[PDB]
Point group: C3
Chain length 310, copies 3
C-alpha cells in the first residue's frame, strides 16, 4: 500500500514519487526532510500524502538543481541548512520599528543584528536560494533566510557568532563586483602606498568606526604612517573596530552594531538612525535623541566619493 | 564466546552469547553499556553477565520499548543513552531533604525541575518516567534526568527553561481530571469564560501571585479587560511570568524558580518554603526569614477552589 | 581517470594509493580527512595529487600504527581528534612573553591556561603523538597538541573546561611513575595517619593553594595535615576559586578564575622578572597580583620536613 508525495533539493522543481508504506523514507530516498525534521528513519505516515520532502543530491537532475539554486558543491550543505532550519522555524520574528528582528534564543543576537542591517543596505545575492529567502525575510518569513545564513557560514544553532565575520561570508555571495575603493598610506620615510580593492574588500574596513576620520587621516605602523580614503564607489561602507565606548550622533550613519561582554558573555544589540535613534535588542526596543556604548560596526550610505588631498 | 544481557527497558533482560572476535555492533546493531556507545568495540572479559541496551531490531523489543517509553521515535534511545553517558558523572547531593545537582553543563534548569517535581503531587503515564521518578526521590536521579533531556529533545550543555521543561513533562503526567475555569469581563465585549482540561489547567503565563489571579488581572480585549479564576481542581498550580523582582513570603507558596542573567548568562536557583525559606543553588544552600529576587515560576498547593464573584 | 595520494593514521607511516576520480574518498577508504576537514563525502579533486590524508583504522597495519602512536584502542579517537583539529587550526597561537598562548575562541581560556603552564613545568608524554605535538607546540604550531588534548580528555570545541581536570587526564599519559609524596594527619584523639602516593596523585592536591602552608600545617575533620616527603619536578596546588595575593618568585605560574556558572573565565599568571597576566592574546604586568586563583604550580626537586 503506497502514497503520493514530492521530493526536491530547491523546493521549486518538485519530483513526483510513490513511497512504499512499510519501508522507511531513508531506505527509498536516503537523507529525507519534512520542513527541517529528519524523517530518514521513520516510515511514510498518512498525513504526508502530497507533501514536499527535501532529499540529498542522489542523481544528476538533483546535483544540477542544487548547484543552480545554492551556488555550492558542499555535499554537507543541505544537512546543516535543514538542521539549522529545524530550530529557526521555532524562533519568533517580530516586526520592530518596520524591521524583522528575532526574539533572543540560542545566542542568535548576531543573526538578529545581521538581519536588521541587511534590511537597511542596498545588496543583491548571487545565489537564488539567498535572494529568494532575503525577499521573504523582509516580508516576515525570515526562518529560511536565517537557516541559509547559518548554513553558508558553517555555523550551528547555539554557537556564538560575529556580525562582521557573518557579513563578510554573506558579501562573498553578494554582487559587489562594480564596488571599488582607493586607499593611500603616506610616510615621510617610505613615501606613498595606494591600493585598488574590488568586490567584498572594497566596502569592509577593520581599524576605526568614523567614516569622516577615514577620509581625513588614520595613524598606523610602517614608527607611524597616515592612511586616508582617495576614492569610494559603493552603495554602503562597513566600518568595524574592536568594541570601544563611542557616541553615535543621529543621522550621521545608517545603522550600527553594539557589543557588551568579553568572552562567552558577549551580546550584540542593533542601533538604527531614523527620525530619532532606536536600539533594537531582539524583541525589545528603546529610543533616545543620542546614544553612547561599545560599538564594533557602523554602516554608512555612499554613492561616489573623491578626496580633496594632493 | 561469553554470556551477557540485551534489553530496551532494563526490566525484560534477554540472554545472549556474543562472539569475542566480532564487535557488538555486527551482532546487535547500536549497543550501549551504561550510556557508553560500545557498537564499534569487541566483547571484553569484564562484560560477562552485564546488561547492554540495544535498538528495537525485532518485534519483542519493538513492543517492550513502546510499552515502557510510550514513544515510537527511533532516535529516542540514542539521545537518552547520550544524555545518560553525561548525567551518570553529575553529583546528586541531598539538600534539605531534596535531590539537587551540583552545577555542570548549564544544568541549573534540570536541578530546579528535579527539586520542584519532589514537592508537587504527580504521576507519569510512561513507566520509564515513573520508575526513574521514584529512584530520583531516593537519590539515584541520573536516569530520571537523562529521560527528561530525552523526552524534551534537549542535549547536555544546551541552555534550558524550567517552565518549558515542566510543560513537556506534564504532557506525560496523568492530569486528565484537572480542570480550570477563567472569566474575562470587559464593559464593551461582555463576559468570556473558558474550560481548560489537562496540562493547560495547571500552568498560566502572565503573573506569579495566585491570590491576585483570583481577584483580578488586566489584559487587552481596542480596550483592557479583567481576568479572574472561577474554579480550580488540581493538586498544584504553576504561575509563570517573565522574570521580575518579587517578594516571597514564607508559607504562601510551595516552591519557586529564580532567574538572574539575561541572554546566555542566565542562572536558575530554586526557593522552597519549609520551617523557613531555603534557596537551593545546586549543591549550595541559603536560609532567610524572607526572600526578594527575580522569580519566573511559583508553585502553589491546591485541592478545589470556587470564587465568591 | 585516477591520481596518486597518501593515507596514514600517524603521519609517519605513509601508505601510497591510486584513487578513482568518479568515486568519493569515503567509498574507497571510509572516514578520510585532509588537515581535519572531513572529505568522506567529496570526490578526489585536482589540488590533492600527492597530499597526505588521515583515514580510520580499517585493517591490521593501521590498527597497530594507531595504537603504537596514540596509546589508545578507542575507535572514536581519530574522528574526534580530526573534528577538534578542524577548528583548532583556525585559532591564533601568538607568542606572549616567550610562551605560545591562544586568542580567545570557543571557551578555550582553559586550554590556553593548560598550554601556558605545560611550557613551564618539566614533563614527558608516554604517547609519541602527544610528545611530538608538545615539541611543535613550544615552537608555535600548537593546533595539533590542542586537538590531541581535547581528544584525550573526551572534550569538544566550545565545551566549557577545567584546567585542573585537564592537567589530571594529561598527567595519566605523562611519565610520573618515579614521583612520590608522603602526607601525615595528626589528631590528639585518633593518633597519626601517613599515606604513600605515587604517579599522578603525588603532584596534585585539592584543598589549599599555599605550598609553604602545606608543609607547616592544615586543619581538616579536627586534625593537622602536613607534607612529610615530596619527590617530583613540580607540585600543583588547587582550591575552590578564592581571593589570594601572589608574591613575585614564590611560585612558577597560577590559574585565575572569575565568573560563577557558564560565565567563568581563566587567566594565566606567571612569575618572571616581574608578574605577567596572560589573558589569551592580551598581556598585563604588575609588581604584585591579587585575584581569584584556583591553581598554583611550584618548582620542586626533593623535600623532607623537620617535624
Ligand atoms: Cl539584537
Ligand atoms: Cl538550582
Ligand atoms: Cl589565558
Ligand atoms: Zn615609514
Ligand atoms: Zn473589550
Ligand atoms: Zn555568560
Ligand atoms: Zn580525630
Amino acid at each position: 500500500r503506497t502514497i503520493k508525495v514530492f521530493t526536491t533539493v530547491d523546493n521549486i522543481n518538485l519530483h513526483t514519487q510513490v513511497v512504499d508504506m512499510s519501508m522507511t523514507y531513508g531506505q527509498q530516498f536516503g537523507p529525507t526532510y519534512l520542513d527541517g525534521a529528519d524523517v530518514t528513519k521513520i516510515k511514510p505516515h498518512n498525513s504526508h500524502e502530497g507533501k514536499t520532502f527535501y532529499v540529498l543530491p542522489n542523481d544528476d537532475t538533483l546535483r544540477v538543481e542544487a548547484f543552480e539554486y545554492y551556488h555550492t558543491t558542499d555535499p554537507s550543505f543541505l544537512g546543516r541548512y535543514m538542521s539549522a532550519l529545524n530550530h529557526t522555524k521555532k524562533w519568533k520574528y517580530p516586526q520592530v520599528n518596520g524591521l524583522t528582528s528575532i526574539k533572543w534564543a540560542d545566542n542568535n543576537c548576531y543573526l538578529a543584528t545581521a538581519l536588521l542591517t541587511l534590511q537597511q543596505i542596498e545588496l543583491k545575492f548571487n545565489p537564488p536560494a539567498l535572494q529568494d529567502a532575503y525577499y521573504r525575510a523582509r516580508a516576515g518569513e525570515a526562518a529560511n533566510f536565517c537557516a541559509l545564513i547559518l548554513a553558508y557560514c558553517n555555523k550551528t544553532v547555539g554557537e556564538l557568532g560575529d556580525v562582521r565575520e557573518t557579513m563578510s561570508y554573506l558579501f562573498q555571495h553578494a554582487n559587489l563586483d562594480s564596488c571599488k575603493r582607493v586607499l593611500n598610506v603616506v610616510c615621510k620615510t617610505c613615501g606613498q602606498q595606494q591600493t585598488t580593492l574590488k568586490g567584498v574588500e572594497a566596502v569592509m574596513y577593520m581599524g576605526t568606526l568614523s567614516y569622516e576620520q577615514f577620509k581625513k587621516g588614520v595613524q598606523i605602523p610602517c614608527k607611524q604612517a597616515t592612511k586616508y580614503l582617495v576614492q569610494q564607489e559603493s552603495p554602503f561602507v562597513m566600518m568595524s573596530a574592536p568594541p570601544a565606548q563611542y557616541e553615535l550622533k543621529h543621522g550621521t550613519f545608517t545603522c550600527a552594531s553594539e557589543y557588551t561582554g568579553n568572552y562567552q558573555c558577549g551580546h550584540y544589540k542593533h542601533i538604527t538612525s531614523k527620525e530619532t535613534l532606536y536600539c533594537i535588542d531582539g524583541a525589545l526596543l528603546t529610543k533616545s535623541s543620542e546614544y553612547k556604548g561599545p560599538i564594533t560596526d557602523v554602516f554608512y550610505k555612499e554613492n561616489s566619493y573623491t578626496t580633496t588631498i594632493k
